Structure 1
Amino acid sequence: PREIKTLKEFLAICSRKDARCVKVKHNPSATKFKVRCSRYLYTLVVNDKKKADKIERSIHPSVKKIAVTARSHAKT
């Protein structure tokens, strides 16, 4: 796994052709945007919730968006 530092290079990761999906994780103190690429899972950590909402809308519509939840054993 690799950490994305700034938002400018995060949009470059999602723009890649091998970015299958973006997993949005809602932690109580931060929001993580985990981009599943071919070789690495790139993560951008956003602490401010207002910025996280703005960033989520800015995600390209080509990349599928997955909202990370706790899937149940019965569900799985």
Structure 2
Amino acid sequence: PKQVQEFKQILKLLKSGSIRAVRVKTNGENTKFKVRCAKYLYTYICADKAKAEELKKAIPKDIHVVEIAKKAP
């Protein structure tokens, strides 16, 4: 597992076709966008709800998205 640091690199990950799945985990303070790629699982810790919504919109519609909360699937 690797972590992307700022908002720019994460977008290029969803823009690229290498993506396989996306899981969004909402915590009591932040929300993590975990992009399941071929080799690694990249994650972005978004602490701003406004920028979280922007990242949710940028997800391609043909990919599976899992929304996680206090209860795991």
Fold match, TM over 0.5?
yes
**TM-score if structure 1 supplies the norm length?**
0.80
Deviation at 1:15, TM superposition (A): 2.5
What is the CA deviation profile of residues 15-60 of structure 1, one whole-angstrom value per residue up to 9, with x for unaligned ones?
3333111100101100100000010000011001222122211222
* Identity score, percent: 35
Unaligned runs of 5+ residues in structure 2 are none
Query: What RMSD in Å do the two structures reach over aligned CA positions?
Result: 1.5
Deviation at 1:9, TM superposition (A): 1.1
Unaligned runs of 5+ residues in structure 1 are 72-76
Partner amino acid for 1:66? V
**TM-score if structure 2 supplies the norm length?**
0.82
Count of aligned residue pairs for this structure pair:
71
Moved over 3 A (4+): none
